[PDB]
Point group: D2
Chain length 228, copies 4
Amino acid sequence: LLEGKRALITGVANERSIAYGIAKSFHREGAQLAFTYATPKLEKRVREIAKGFGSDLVVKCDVSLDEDIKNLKKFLEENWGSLDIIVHSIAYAPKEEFKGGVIDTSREGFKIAMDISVYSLIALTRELLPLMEGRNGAIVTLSYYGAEKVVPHYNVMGIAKAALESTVRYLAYDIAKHGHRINAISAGPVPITIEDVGDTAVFLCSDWARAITGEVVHVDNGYHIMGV
Amino acid sequence: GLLEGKRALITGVANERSIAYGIAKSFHREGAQLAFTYATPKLEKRVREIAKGFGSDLVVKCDVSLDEDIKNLKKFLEENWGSLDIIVHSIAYAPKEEFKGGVIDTSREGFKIAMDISVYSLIALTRELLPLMEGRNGAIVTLSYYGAEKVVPHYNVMGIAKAALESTVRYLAYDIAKHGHRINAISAGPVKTLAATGFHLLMEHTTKVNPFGKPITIEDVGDTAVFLCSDWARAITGEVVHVDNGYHIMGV
Amino acid sequence: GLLEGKRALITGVANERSIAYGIAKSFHREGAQLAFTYATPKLEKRVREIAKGFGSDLVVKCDVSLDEDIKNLKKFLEENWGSLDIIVHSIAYAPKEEFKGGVIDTSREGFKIAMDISVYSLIALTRELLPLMEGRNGAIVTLSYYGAEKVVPHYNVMGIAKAALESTVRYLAYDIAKHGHRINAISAGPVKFGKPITIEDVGDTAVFLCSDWARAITGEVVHVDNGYHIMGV
Amino acid sequence: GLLEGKRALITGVANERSIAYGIAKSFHREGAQLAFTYATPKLEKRVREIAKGFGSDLVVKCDVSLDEDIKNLKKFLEENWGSLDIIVHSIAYAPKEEFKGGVIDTSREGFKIAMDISVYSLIALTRELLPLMEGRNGAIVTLSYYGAEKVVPHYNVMGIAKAALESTVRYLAYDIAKHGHRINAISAGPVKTLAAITGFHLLMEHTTKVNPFGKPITIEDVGDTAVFLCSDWARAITGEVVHVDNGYHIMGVF
């Protein structure tokens, strides 16, 4: 339960977004919410979604842009002045990258995949950590089994998610000095539901999970266990 | 109230410092009804007193080395509940001599005991009690330790047992899924318990190395156990969750 | 050749299709001298015949469930060789009943037997034979399977045993490194892309892992499985 | 030798302390014919002299950040060999500043460079050179580090890179298997190289104290493992990460 907690939600595009399921569970559990939208064409839907949860706090943020990350800090500084939770649900590679195999990955497509899907977590964490000072905050990100095993056609995203899980470990080391935690949910195809992810996110971002950091929790109906 | 209307069997309570006591405490807070085993006749008194403190009258002797004790446990729960939601498996033992040198010095008999009590008991309890869980959204949780994954000097045969335990969890998840049940492990960091050679140094080293510079508590385990045994974790099975203040991340 | 001047004990040969036979074959090719255990009297004839074909007359009965058989094996090696370089541990068993149903159906006695034969035997052999390896920089190799890591239906208690075995390899690596020795596991795919491997695949990997070329490798599990382990399907 | 009649491309030699030099040395002992890349014009002389020492006249400049250099590398190998058995990928870089604090302090540009040079280069080289391996039983080996799996302070963005690299190896194994080829990683322990950074001495000391042998690995340990992994003895081994680290990876206390 997240009473008194202020959470930033990234990655809401619509009502089927994994981040929507997280926001839904967070709202139920008493969290106040703020949202990013990735592009201008998503602003209307994200604003409506935020309003449906009683939030008017919506800000444009292209995570490939340093200036947008700094602007996000400023927006949160001005409207809240502190922060408890970051939900990082941002993953992208150009669609061409999923055709063929990893062997067919373009250099630019690789750069884009890593920057959006992995570096964005570092940039958000660095920039927003000051807002969390003295709060014992929590960050959660999303991964997939393709990080650990070959899922054909997942391609560069399997590489990105392996990098992401390592990033979670290093960031856990960094931010523990300031009292904060960061974990990943390795989600099955959304099969699980977005609500399965959301309820797991609530726990991991709650004080009940105070001893859990740098962990990857599989929310996948046990898919990960199978050897055949 | 995440466990409202849930019935949970708690194994492994010896005293108020036991990991299972932490689990009972969190489960109680969250609305679970509790039943307890005690391992040896000497523990009866304090386990009954502990149960009473949680509003439970259900305490029964169960030495998991004994097939008849497991059967009688089932009979006891059939009479007093007739359905079951949760099994907390917090049982680990090896003769103390097995911790003195290295794994190379493990005795055959000590090995057999360690695996039987620390691993096989999970299989026996799961098989025996599964019928009582029918129609329920059952959850089982067991306790492991990082010594399953890496070498922790003096943990020895228990590092072998815990690796077997985590594999056992995976196979059991596969078995019990078709009955609508889940099973997971909590890989807990060191806690100063009655149950837990070289402990002081292990505890000190772990505390120094983990990113928080502090040990976990039995309450940390309990709160994680609540989640994993609740319907919020309906999509989580065969998983090992580290409740260790980040110790598992370090490559120093 | 890679194993010249090295003396290797081979456990687990039952016949020419035994994984240990492939290891013995590769070991022989590479110049190792060989000694064999046989598990039961009814296997003596075939094992002696196999040993002879490799130019060995060093064959000894060893039921690894028996402490006295393990002590006796040390004596046999002390008498005939007086030193040792390599142990090949290829010993895994559970009563056939245990592979019916799932792990949930495992009997207590079947579990005890599986762990004792498949896992504890490695500890007992390593402890007992380590003195013979003194000052040689020895190497031990054991066998595992992907069912240690992931669920392979019907592998059951052996999946538990193999997970325990791999952990045992790590702890033993820690123990024996201070005496200059190494121990590793080969996680073999099913035996003769992600297709069945051969006993020769295992054998040539065993030679490397038990050679001085692998001097920096210990407590490792090497998958010899045509890449099966990578798949998330 | 185990590599008799095999032709191997060696990337990443800067001097005789380089991990790739150890690999070249073992490969040479074992009968491989060698070709070398050098990363920058300043390394040319050094790498040509090292190649000469192994009886090789095949050295070519290849900056892996450049698509045209990878294309020209292929053209060079087509002209001088026309077939290829082995690629040794020993390429890792991030700007020095990235090792100074924690991963939290990583710059966007330093991250991009690290991933491009340390990870993407493997994909580029594998894709470009695979045709030269057609009909051969090819093998590729790359170098990783335990920082891919666990937190090694100050290894930072390289620990992210190496985790991506190990995943890249798995996916490439899947891709190249249908052409009869294999690819593996050696997760090597610390070695004092030109390339190996903030806190190196302490990392080296700590690793040496903690590993069960109480000593670091050598470039020759890596070389001998690479020979096996790139030989037909390892025909059944692909997508694997092999720790060549004197047992460091087993330790759960430090």
